[PDB]
Amino acid sequence: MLLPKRVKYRREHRGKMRGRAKGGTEVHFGEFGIQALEASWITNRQIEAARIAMTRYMKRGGKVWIKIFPSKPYTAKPLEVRMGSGKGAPEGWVAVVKPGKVLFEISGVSEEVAREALRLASHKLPIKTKFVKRE
Amino acid sequence: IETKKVVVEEIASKLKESKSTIIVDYRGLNVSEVTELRKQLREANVEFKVYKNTMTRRAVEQNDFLTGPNAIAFSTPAKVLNDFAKNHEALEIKAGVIEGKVSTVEEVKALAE
Amino acid sequence: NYESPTITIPLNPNKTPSENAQAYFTKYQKAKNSVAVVEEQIRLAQEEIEYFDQLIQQLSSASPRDISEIREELVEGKYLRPHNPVLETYESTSGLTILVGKNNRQNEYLTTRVAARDDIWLHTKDIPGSHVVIRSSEPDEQTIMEAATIAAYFSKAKDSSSVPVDYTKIRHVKKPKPGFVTYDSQHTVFVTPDADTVI
């Protein structure tokens, strides 16, 4: 469960997703990447689920260069409650996206292994993506 | 396809250099009977090999016999072939040549007998 | 039996000659594996028995620093739970100095850490004792007799003379496993003794 250990404000305004990825849209710390075609709000539990998936398919698989960090928190009020009475309480964390953004690079392991590992990684996920590699 | 050109080139080299050779169909006989034949032709010192028909025909023009899977025996023999043949009888004795003496079936038989 | 007894076996109808043949081989290899497992277990057990006897061999010669040292040895054996304190020596009756390998670890420190190779070494021949060494001193008749003597009256067989300690070049002194060392390629010297010469 990726975390920021320290925060300024426990809470935020929620945010939006328009446009496209500023940077990190291409594999250059690793060899064989995966990138977005969409965007959403994402959990460290999900990304580490993919981690364990790929690293068990590969069993130590190479090296990654993860591109992201779940900086954003989100709240979740208690249950069967009405509106108002102040903002809800912080619940977990969130990792945000823009399309064209790369999430995981890979290196040290064969391209075909990469393809299938990231297949099993991708099928976890709510989004549409594709494989990439370095220029 | 330059590699094809090398292949056709080398086969052409041996195929031009062929001065006596008897030509036969090979079919319906295991690798072990084949190797028996090879033992007796090796000790015969009559040089047996296996090649392809498009290329053999291109040599002959350089044909009706030449289709079907064909092997060869160089000289510079067919008696050993008569032996194996009447012993086993899964072959054909379609044609031959000696010093450019392109040979009928009966003529390779005469050379073989 | 190619021998010809004509045994009429049990063969398990409703089950094939093959099935029951390879099932006979199955129980064969099974009893084989069970008993071989149990016999390497019991081999471990017998080497453990003489490992008690070896622990005791050293213990009968052990001093209180050796008590603590063997408490360390049995943390190592896992059996106990409680810094350079290698070993000690004694004054041979022949005006020499004999290093007294006083324990398992004290023997490691007096022989494997202290003594030199091709030296004169000795251990109690099947008597509960400690080992000794005239390290880099090729024990002559007098020196070897005095060292074998100190052992022959320091053992639990101190009443028994003719302690036949095998001595030779320590180059052949074996070492292994762990605590599995030997002194081989060695000629035996039978000894008896007095005591107070050691000091």
């Binding site: - | 033992k39 090796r42 000790e43 | 190619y2």
Partner: protein, 132 residues
């Protein structure tokens, strides 16, 4: 059927008593036929191929022993290398290669001496042996 038996032994039932007990031959009868023809060392190993016609007209060809046997006798191994290319538990000579050629060039299966050696050395590396 291929058998693999010492030249002097006879009546090992469990090997061939099956293998030609469905054929139904005298175990010691045929094994002493074998010893009478290969009246040679027991403890040795001859490969021997038996050919039986439909009417039970059995014949056979005895052949030269294995190079495994010859070089077990040479190097002094019981098992080959426990891991060839990692352990070499036995060693022979080029002279030994020629000795085994001259022994078995009837049974060897490449027309040239050098290709015979290629196959022999394929087997030498099969069983993991070095050369002197």
């Amino acid at each position: 059927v291929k058998l693999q038996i010492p030249a002097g032994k006879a009546n090992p039932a469990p090997p061939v008593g099956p293998a030609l007990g469905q054929a139904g031959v005298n175990i010691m009868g045929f094994c002493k036929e074998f010893n009478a023809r290969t009246a040679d060392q027991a403890g040795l190993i001859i490969p021997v191929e038996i050919s039986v016609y439909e009417d039970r007209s059995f014949t056979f060809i005895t052949k030269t022993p294995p190079a495994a046997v010859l070089l077990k006798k040479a190097a002094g191994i019981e098992s080959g290398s426990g891991e060839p290319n990692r352990n070499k538990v036995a060693t022979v000579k080029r002279d030994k290669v020629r000795e085994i050629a001259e022994t078995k060039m009837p049974d060897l299966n490449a027309a040239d001496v050098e290709a015979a050696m290629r196959m022999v050395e394929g087997t030498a590396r099969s069983m993991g042996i070095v050369i002197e």
